[PDB]
Design a protein around this nucleic acid. Structure first.
Ligand SMILES: [Zn+2]
Ligand SMILES: [Zn+2]
Ligand SMILES: [Zn+2]
Ligand SMILES: [Zn+2]
Lengths: 66, 103
DNA sequence: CAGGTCATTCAGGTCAG
DNA sequence: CTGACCTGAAATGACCTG
């Protein structure tokens, strides 16, 4: 996955991504609000840490193209 | 996830952003809910040891340790959000009228 | 692979001890 | 008062639909 560490279920929206970042981004823009990092957009998005920060994960989504 | 970052006991996952045990989770929740902290007063110098056995010996040191490690006092629902939750759960229990609506 | 499911995986309340 | 145990909302992420 161009976002976390997990395998990609092919391409979705703006890049190949996992069903986790897929579902995550699938839900985000639809029922959209505004995530806010509790830290300083440093949160390393990886398989074991991806759900920790929705800000970084979202920005990370649109950042790598989506 | 495995051990409580506040006292070292076995933890039950994330609670208020930190890996904690049911003990520190409950204590934190109740201190914030009832604003009990101001009355907390260490009876020596705030250097008390907080471990899985001594955690209840000094309420102030235990709370200052919960803050230090990063427990989020903002994840403890205020009265409007807490009451909204109870309201929701009670009214949801209206699955009762549907059960009887089946037949 | 846009599309939906929808079983599964952290809050407040409880009450014995 | 504490905390082991519980209830259930809500979010995640697997797996199907055409
Ligand atoms: Zn991913
Ligand atoms: Zn972040
Ligand atoms: Zn603890
Ligand atoms: Zn003390």
């Amino acid at each position: 996955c161009a976002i976390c560490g997990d395998r990609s279920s092919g391409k979705h929206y703006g890049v190949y991504s996992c069903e986790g970042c897929k579902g995550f981004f699938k839900r985000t823009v639809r029922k959209d609000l505004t995530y806010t990092c509790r830290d300083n957009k440093d949160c390393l998005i990886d398989k074991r840490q991806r759900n920790r920060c929705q800000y970084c994960r979202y920005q990370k989504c649109l950042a790598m193209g989506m | 996830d495995e051990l409580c970052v506040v006292c070292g006991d076995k933890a039950t996952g994330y609670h208020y952003r930190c890996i904690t045990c049911e003990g520190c989770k409950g204590f934190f929740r109740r201190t914030i809910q009832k604003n009990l902290h101001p009355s907390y007063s260490c009876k020596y110098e705030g250097k008390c040891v907080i471990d899985k056995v001594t955690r209840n010996q000094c309420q102030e040191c235990r709370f200052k340790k919960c803050i230090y490690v990063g427990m989020a006092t903002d994840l403890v629902l205020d009265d409007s959000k807490r009451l909204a939750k109870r309201k929701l759960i009670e009214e949801n229990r209206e699955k009762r009228r549907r059960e009887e609506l089946e037949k």
